[PDB]
Specification:
It comes from Homo sapiens (Human). It is found in: Secreted. The chain has 133 residues and is mostly helical. It has a single domain, classed as Growth Hormone, Chain: A (Up-down Bundle), CATH 1.20.1250. Helices cover 54% and strands 3% of the residues. The chain has 5 helices and 2 strands. A two-stranded antiparallel ribbon has the order 1-2. Helix 1 runs antiparallel to helix 5. The longest helix is centred in the middle third of the chain and has 24 residues. It is globular. The two termini are 19 Å apart.
């Protein structure tokens, strides 16, 4: 394989991964991030992945080792480790498909990661239901 539309395999898999991070999105999503869905005009899916990929980088780099998401139990420690891994995979694949270099994320106020991930699942599914025809 080689001739095709990079979107059916790499992206459908990137969708199930986007839903995997939606499992623990209540205690770790209480950390305001940037809202990249306030002004979408000429931005396509690839541009929205490189931007959301930069914000996803700060999520797995800083919160990956923050007592905030940790909690105070040994069980939440093993579960948290699984969240950081699923993130690394979506940080290289989400924008890896975009094929971009710099992505100055900046037009956005302090939104809550709860509504951010919410719009991430809605955009991935709704727009990928027509990726292939």
């Amino acid at each position: 394989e080689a001739e095709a539309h990079k979107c059916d395999i790499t992206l459908q898999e990137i969708i199930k991964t986007l839903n995997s991070l939606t499992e623990q999105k209540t205690l770790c999503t209480e950390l305001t991030v940037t809202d990249i869905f306030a002004a979408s005009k000429d931005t396509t899916e690839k541009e929205t992945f490189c931007r959301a990929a930069t914000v996803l980088r700060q999520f797995y780099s800083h919160h990956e080792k923050d007592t905030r998401c940790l909690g105070a139990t040994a069980q939440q420690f093993h579960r948290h480790k699984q969240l950081i891994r699923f993130l690394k995979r979506l940080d290289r694949n989400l924008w890896g498909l975009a094929g971009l270099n710099s992505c100055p994320v900046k037009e956005a106020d302090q939104s809550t990661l709860e509504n951010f991930l919410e719009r991430l699942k809605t955009i991935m599914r709704e727009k990928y239901s027509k990726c292939s025809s």
